[PDB]
Design an enzyme around this catalytic site. Structure first.
Site, mmCIF file in Angstrom:
data_model
loop_
_atom_site.group_PDB
_atom_site.id
_atom_site.type_symbol
_atom_site.label_atom_id
_atom_site.label_comp_id
_atom_site.label_asym_id
_atom_site.label_seq_id
_atom_site.Cartn_x
_atom_site.Cartn_y
_atom_site.Cartn_z
ATOM 1 N N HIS A 41 0.621 -1.387 0.178
ATOM 2 C CA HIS A 41 0.025 -0.039 -0.132
ATOM 3 C C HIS A 41 0.931 1.366 0.068
ATOM 4 C CE1 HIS A 41 -0.770 -0.288 4.818
ATOM 5 N NE2 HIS A 41 0.146 0.546 4.546
ATOM 6 N N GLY A 143 1.904 6.053 9.740
ATOM 7 C CA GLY A 143 3.262 6.319 9.354
ATOM 8 C C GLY A 143 3.780 4.963 10.208
ATOM 9 N N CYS A 145 3.206 1.830 9.699
ATOM 10 C CA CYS A 145 3.252 0.626 8.922
ATOM 11 C C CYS A 145 4.623 0.615 8.297
ATOM 12 C CB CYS A 145 2.233 1.166 7.636
ATOM 13 S SG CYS A 145 0.683 1.366 7.974
HETATM 14 C C1 P7L Z 1 -2.288 4.888 1.485
HETATM 15 O O1 P7L Z 1 -2.399 5.322 2.952
HETATM 16 C C2 P7L Z 1 -3.249 4.608 3.589
HETATM 17 C C3 P7L Z 1 -2.750 3.481 3.997
HETATM 18 C C4 P7L Z 1 -3.228 2.673 4.948
HETATM 19 C C5 P7L Z 1 -4.427 3.033 5.603
HETATM 20 N N1 P7L Z 1 -5.037 2.340 6.581
HETATM 21 C C6 P7L Z 1 -6.306 1.836 6.285
HETATM 22 C C7 P7L Z 1 -6.169 0.709 5.580
HETATM 23 C C8 P7L Z 1 -5.042 -0.310 5.526
HETATM 24 C C9 P7L Z 1 -5.250 -1.480 4.891
HETATM 25 CL CL1 P7L Z 1 -3.912 -2.688 4.502
HETATM 26 C C10 P7L Z 1 -6.529 -1.846 4.463
HETATM 27 S S1 P7L Z 1 -7.407 -0.346 4.866
HETATM 28 C C11 P7L Z 1 -4.591 2.135 8.119
HETATM 29 O O2 P7L Z 1 -5.169 1.397 8.613
HETATM 30 C C12 P7L Z 1 -3.310 2.697 8.272
HETATM 31 C C13 P7L Z 1 -2.938 2.847 9.936
HETATM 32 C C14 P7L Z 1 -2.170 1.778 10.420
HETATM 33 N N2 P7L Z 1 -1.932 1.904 11.706
HETATM 34 C C15 P7L Z 1 -2.529 2.952 12.674
HETATM 35 C C16 P7L Z 1 -2.971 3.844 11.756
HETATM 36 C C17 P7L Z 1 -3.603 4.828 12.700
HETATM 37 C C18 P7L Z 1 -4.095 6.062 12.089
HETATM 38 C C19 P7L Z 1 -4.470 5.969 10.912
HETATM 39 C C20 P7L Z 1 -4.148 4.962 9.853
HETATM 40 C C21 P7L Z 1 -3.369 3.799 10.507
HETATM 41 C C22 P7L Z 1 -4.812 4.554 5.681
HETATM 42 C C23 P7L Z 1 -4.307 5.126 4.436
#
Ligand code: P7L
Ligand code: P7L
Lengths: 306, 305
Positions: A41, A143, A145
């Protein structure tokens, strides 16, 4: 004496963390030999996550679209492939700090240490358990991830988790380092929910043995039980079935304490049936299930990593 | 989102851990520049520990009585002094992995990471608080002595704790890196007891602000309190007095959540009165007191090193 949520020392894994950028998306990567592993992603915008076609999105990216930083020293990407939900960035330089490592897919109940990272820099380290619903209860902010989960098995770092997503309940979901998701989850922004969770029975028994080692014994009783009869009671209280394999893994703790596994099972059966009676075990009011049998032995026998 | 007991990454401290042997006693040392720091009780036997004269025991030692091992490398001791309850062994080589570091003394309520070590090798890392009674609730076995506690700030490691002993209650006692014990404890095997422990009130409030930041408000109420009425109630549950300094330190969390410190004090008063009624706060069935106000900001704002 004493018992604490205890992580593996993070030194060997700190040596492997890098920043990965693709567009206005920056997250963490794991640098082992001449490859950087990160969530696929990274090639997605927030809008792309609603209906991503990863094949099409990757087919449009080139080696030079991916900016990797290792501290503040740039690595050149000379290749990219997708394995399931991880991106593999082939780089010009082998990581000199690459430790002895394997990729391990863990079973529900197994624990690991998380090195929580932002922009390739470590924020801290904590212990997680893979829940039976294939989620983890983590501390992850945007961030995070690409942050990884690991165990040290003798002299080998075993990488078992890469952080991908936060579910609406606030629990976290991720993949093994081959990009295979733990649980029925997808890397698209769509309706996804944590399933009903269960208690990790083998780990509660591990933690009752921890309590006995630390001199907390009030819950031991003169009763015994069969594996079958224990499981009939356990399952009423949303506890995972205890297998004969679980019994054998608890053998070392049983031998060290001289309390038979099925005797500890009978003690747990009365705890579930009767509650605690406003008493505590290792200064907890609830039965803890995020310690494995090996976690107890490693902490209580002072096993070291060199 | 989420909130977890989080240790500092241990890598910079792992780089400084060595094994120190004197006679049949082996424990951990901290190697920074050309000095190795260890508990001065390394020069003692088991019988020695009741009433040791460390000046008399040390004057009997030569440099070569101290065996310092860093992995497979023997380090040559070329000098020794005692500073209070720590031994400083001068060695012939500066530690190439020495980080930027300071020695600090912490106050009760402040938290740090412990890298638990045996024979100069790490077992694991956990987060700890200096209890009000100047003990720590650690996980330490025989041979853990010389294990250190620290904080990281930017790329600087501040070492606040060196492990020396376990008390009969199973709590742990130690010194700063200048060898001054936290609390009234002494490096003697004479009977010593931890003073009555109290809950770190400012930390519990910090942790309630953490719970709010993480989207949980069930425990709030319509009430406020004076500082004085709060302290009169909280002391009946063996909670530390809350000072105006504590209130000021909670200022940033108050401002971020829009909940006045004394309104959160009102919430805590009710929680002590009612308990959780089968609920949890950040996955805990008890009120947690080993997060500082800064720990909440650091973890909730994603500070790195
Ligand atoms: C391209 O940009 C993005 C990438 C991932 C996210 N998400 C939503 C999703 C991930 C997946 Cl795999 C499917 S939906 C997340 O869950 C990331 C995430 C992670 N851990 C804490 C998080 C805390 C706050 C916000 C997002 C978090 C959102 C946007
Ligand atoms: C020379 O050999 C020894 C040196 C120190 C110890 N003690 C007892 C004392 C230390 C001090 Cl200082 C005064 S009494 C400890 O408390 C060490 C220790 C540490 N942390 C967990 C411990 C757990 C069990 C037993 C000892 C532990 C004992 C022998």
């Amino acid at each position: 004496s004493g018992f604490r949520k205890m992580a593996f020392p993070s030194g060997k894994v700190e040596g492997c963390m890098v920043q990965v950028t693709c567009g206005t998306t920056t997250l963490n990567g794991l640098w082992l030999d001449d490859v950087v592993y990160c969530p696929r992603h990274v090639i997605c915008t927030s809008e792309d996550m609603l209906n991503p076609n990863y094949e099409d999105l990757l087919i449009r990216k080139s080696n030079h679209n991916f900016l990797v930083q290792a501290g503040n020293v740039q690595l050149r990407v000379i290749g990219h492939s997708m394995q399931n939900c991880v991106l593999k960035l082939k780089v010009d330089t082998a990581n000199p700090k690459t430790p002895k490592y394997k990729f391990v897919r863990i079973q529900p109940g197994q624990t690991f240490s998380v090195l929580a990272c932002y922009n390739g820099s470590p924020s801290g380290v904590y212990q997680c358990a893979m829940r039976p619903n294939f989620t983890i209860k983590g501390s992850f902010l945007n961030g995070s991830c690409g942050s990884v989960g690991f165990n040290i098995d003798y002299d080998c770092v075993s990488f078992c988790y890469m952080h991908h997503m936060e579910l609406p309940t606030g629990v976290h979901a991720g993949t093994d380092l081959e990009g295979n998701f733990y649980g029925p989850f997808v890397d698209r922004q769509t309706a996804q929910a944590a399933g009903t969770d269960t208690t990790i029975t083998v780990n509660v028994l591990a933690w009752l043995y921890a309590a006995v080692i630390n001199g907390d014994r009030w819950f031991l009783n003169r009763f015994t039980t069969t594996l079958n009869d224990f499981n009939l009671v356990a399952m009423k209280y949303n506890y995972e079935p205890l297998t004969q394999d679980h019994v054998d893994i608890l053998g070392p703790l049983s031998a060290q304490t001289g309390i038979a596994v099925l005797d500890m099972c009978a003690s747990l059966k009365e705890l579930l049936q009767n509650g605690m009676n406003g008493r505590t075990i290792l200064g907890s009011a609830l039965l803890e299930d995020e310690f494995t049998p090996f976690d107890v032995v490693r902490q209580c026998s002072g096993v070291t990593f060199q």
